[PDB]
Amino acid sequence: SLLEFGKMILEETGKLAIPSYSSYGCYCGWGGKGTPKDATDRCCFVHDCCYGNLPDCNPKSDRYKYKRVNGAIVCEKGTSCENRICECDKAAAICFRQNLNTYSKKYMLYPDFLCKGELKC
Numbered sequence: 447s448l449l450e451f452g453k454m455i456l457e458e459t460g461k462l463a464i465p466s467y468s469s470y471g472c473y474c475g476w477g478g479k480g481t482p483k484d485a486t487d488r489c490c491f492v493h494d495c496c497y498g499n500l501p502d503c504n505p506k507s508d509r510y511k512y513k514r515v516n517g518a519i520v521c522e523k524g525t526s527c528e529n530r531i532c533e534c535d536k537a538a539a540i541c542f543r544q545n546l547n548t549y550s551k552k553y554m555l556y557p558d559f560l561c562k563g564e565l566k567c
């Protein structure tokens with residue numbers, strides 16, 4: 447659910463999901479269309495794509511459990527939706543950590559209309 451995810455992002459990057467990753471580039475946040483603007487935006491696009499192949503799950507509200515095995519995010523057993531949602535989020539937290547260096551504030555609050563071009567999952 448968005449609660450586990452927001453916590454995950456914070457633990458990883460140190461930043462708060464909102465407003466850092468709630469309105470970034472073209473895919474972080476509310477939907478997306480166009481070309482991801484940078485690496486951090488590519489993480490969002492892939493995450494969206496991840497949620498994308500779980501049609502009958504509900505990522506934003508289904509809660510799941512995860513532990514930390516000396517740094518490592520470890521998704522605990524749940525329903526098949528919860529396990530797979532966890533894995534989606536997990537990779538985004540990491541993808542974020544892994545591209546902090548290029549996180550650019552120029553892309554926070556990016557306007558819709560500049561999200562031009564096309565891109566498939």
Ligand SMILES: COc1cc(O)c(C(=O)/C=C/c2ccc(O)cc2)cc1CC=C(C)C
Pocket residue numbers: 448449464468474475476477
């Ligand atoms: C503790 O967390 C919350 C977290 C949230 O993210 C929201 C919220 O209402 C909408 C969030 C948002 C929506 C789309 C998106 O792509 C990124 C962030 C609302 C609440 C909690 C609200 C209370 C009023 C107890």
